Symmetry: C3
Subunit: 333 residues, 3 copies
Amino acid sequence: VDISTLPRVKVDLVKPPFVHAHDQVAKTGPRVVEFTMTIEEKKLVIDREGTEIHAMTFNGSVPGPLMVVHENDYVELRLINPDTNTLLHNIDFHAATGALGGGALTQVNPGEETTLRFKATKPGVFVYHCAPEGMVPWHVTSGMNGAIMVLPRDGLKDEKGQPLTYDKIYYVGEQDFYVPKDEAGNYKKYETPGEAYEDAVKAMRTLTPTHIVFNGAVGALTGDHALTAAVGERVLVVHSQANRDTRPHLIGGHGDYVWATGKFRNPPDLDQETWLIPGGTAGAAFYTFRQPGVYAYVNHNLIEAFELGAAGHFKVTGEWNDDLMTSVVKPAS
Amino acid sequence: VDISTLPRVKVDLVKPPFVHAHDQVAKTGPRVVEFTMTIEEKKLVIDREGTEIHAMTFNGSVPGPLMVVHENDYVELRLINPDTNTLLHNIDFHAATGALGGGALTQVNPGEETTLRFKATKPGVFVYHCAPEGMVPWHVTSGMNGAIMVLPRDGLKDEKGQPLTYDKIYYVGEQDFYVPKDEAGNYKKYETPGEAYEDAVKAMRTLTPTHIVFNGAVGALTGDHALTAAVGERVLVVHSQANRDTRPHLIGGHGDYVWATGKFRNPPDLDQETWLIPGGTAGAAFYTFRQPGVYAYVNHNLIEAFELGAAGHFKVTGEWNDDLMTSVVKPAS
Amino acid sequence: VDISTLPRVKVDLVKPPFVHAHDQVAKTGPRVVEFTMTIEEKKLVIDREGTEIHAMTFNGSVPGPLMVVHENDYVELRLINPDTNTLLHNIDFHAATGALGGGALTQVNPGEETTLRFKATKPGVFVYHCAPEGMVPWHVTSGMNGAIMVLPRDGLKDEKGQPLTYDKIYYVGEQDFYVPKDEAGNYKKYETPGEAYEDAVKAMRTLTPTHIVFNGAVGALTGDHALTAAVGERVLVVHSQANRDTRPHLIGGHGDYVWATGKFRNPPDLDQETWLIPGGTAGAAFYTFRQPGVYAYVNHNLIEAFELGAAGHFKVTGEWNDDLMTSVVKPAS
Ligand SMILES: O=N[O-]
Ligand SMILES: O=N[O-]
Ligand SMILES: O=N[O-]
Ligand SMILES: O=N[O-]
Ligand SMILES: O=N[O-]
Ligand SMILES: O=N[O-]
Ligand SMILES: [Cu+2]
Ligand SMILES: [Cu+2]
Ligand SMILES: [Cu+2]
Ligand SMILES: [Cu+2]
Ligand SMILES: [Cu+2]
Ligand SMILES: [Cu+2]
């Protein structure tokens, strides 16, 4: 096919956990879907203590933004590395086929840009991440990863083939950071990326994250930035982990339909309490809220959640159902 | 519905790995199933060396007892915190919907009790655990977790829809403990829970358990407390891990039908050697014994099994089948 | 049945990642398939730094060779422990039923041999490993493990029941090593296995591998030993991990059909980016190559891959498909 005969549509990305507008069921034929991302190296404060790291981001955020297309669309990404950055970067899409997912074709020094196109031949949610030869885990674990959703052209389906339609979607990127520590246990600090590199490698080789966070920082998805829903709303939560296993859980709810390893041609697992998303994968869980109030959304290694950062909240509006749950006798002497 | 018109049935719980009597296929309509548990803080010796910790238990055991109901029964739990304990506790049921699984409604100080009711709307095995705000992983990793089984009303089914009926059931709770160590590697000791709390947090943050045990101690499911079966018996083994991934394996056998993430509306995985139960989940495996003798049941990280404690035994009675396995030439020079 | 009336066929094993010749669809009735393996304790250099360990092998390699039979064949293994070795060894087959998978029947001191027979009643890929009572994880994590494939008699099938036929097969064994370190972090060295045993236990109990490798060493499946394929070829990659979870990923490709936990009576998962093989399991992924060039095949904990060793390469010959992926604008200022 002459790709030049296909429609082009430009997407304007939004910062996680929000997701750019899209259609679940494709309203057109295949398209070339145009995306632009600008790499930004920046300092980020990642915990309540004020620990500041040198993050490596797509489009200024950890995680990078969720891209959404349909199966057999073409993804055309303009990737820009401004001259205000100092490192070489590239991009690997787990959704794509060939050239290490794109990384072999997209190496950009500061002051360069490139445009990659690939055909999104398989439906699912997938990780994308930077992957410069010889420095791959350093870039990934500095925050340089996100996800892409390739929807089936007729939207999502349950285990019986009937439609599943979400009302809201959120993207939770989970990031393991490896902040080097001195022998006494305090975080070190570094003056340039090259001076940091050996201690960053040492820190990674412990296989023990110092921080595990949603949306780039402890508490990022709490307070005025809590996720929201109403009773009766159908919510899809896309969750990615580019480097390390996680086990999401909605405290007070379930995954009614879960694609734990993210690929929509498979039937979903039903009624999950907790699911395993392997490192290097994106997964997706669908839930219909039945009760209002505060929910926590966590990695259910509870140490990882409550001590290292992998916990967010939902605030859910609506009526309380006492048939489903009630306090018969409130706590009393 | 007026819940007061439904039958009430009181269950009398038993200590793991045994399970209270129940019916696989429901012999009545929906019921309110009444349970009582009394929290007990107590010292427990957890290894052969004599290491003693301050455990936090439901009903005196690690794990807490397995509760069994049917789908769309109501679970009504009286939770008692006697004044001989010193901490605040609560309970979260992964089977329940709303109020953080019940934890928001069940906070009991020493000398208090409460009664929670919830509708068991989804079939499967599920974790329950204590979860006091701000202290969640400490209570869970002190032993304060168990499981609940919500059976389909017509019992279990295989991947084709035909019945699966167990003859025996056992509940294996697997517990990761994080006993603080000094710099030389010896376990520390503490005089009150408050004086222990910071070192307990430090220990948990290593993400490296010091002990990983079945039924509360190294060797608990061996010797006179080995699990038992006969050749030809169908056995269901429910396995939970409230905080950390595990990978069960029956050495010398299989999981003929496994719900690795524990939810019975899904077809089971067949013929598993080993399966992954993610932290925060209960799973269930069904096996029909074909050979007598000693079996080991383990977490198949063999370091976790044989060096840190995650190993039990079955002793199986009956006839040996030389067609299935035989020594053709016994070991000889 | 009188097993003596069945055909016997002797297999001549090959060194991983290659696999002995076999038929996917069984061309005969059930057989006794005869295998011989000779245990070899030997020094192995496992990284680019020259770190040398005392490995424990089946047939001289880490992993041991892949054995291939069909469902309801009998596996008859002659296991030889020459008097040039110094330890006791045995073998456990996860494919077998009874006697701890065979280990209770196959204990061989140096200078002894034994012959075990078992019926391969369940189709799938399975781990085998040494397991001497009281020393199990030491032998396994010294390299003493491999895998066996039990094919369905009518070969592999997709999720719809139609045939899947591979053109090439490779066996990737992934090995976690725990090389003891001194306080400063250098690898220690030991003069006899008995003098090494306590520090080996200490090292294992950290649960932190020092090395995680494919085919026995960093870089083993690269360069002149890269895996190979052509565009359009169907390749099955069998992957095992006898002790620790892994998450394989083909960088630039997919698992078109994956049995993550390795058991062929289950439908495969489709279109996987990454999959979890639990410790103690073998898995298998089927892929049809669509693009030429270099691919990396990794454990997608990228620290484990690129810093600790769990990375290999494919070199794929053929035509480039610019519809599937192209550089629209090559990197430029
Ligand atoms: O289910 N909450 O930890
Ligand atoms: O990959 N399916 O969940
Ligand atoms: O399969 N036993 O370690
Ligand atoms: O959740 N099903 O195994
Ligand atoms: O997908 N590569 O790291
Ligand atoms: O065990 N089935 O992938
Ligand atoms: Cu980068
Ligand atoms: Cu990747
Ligand atoms: Cu508690
Ligand atoms: Cu929980
Ligand atoms: Cu051995
Ligand atoms: Cu084993």
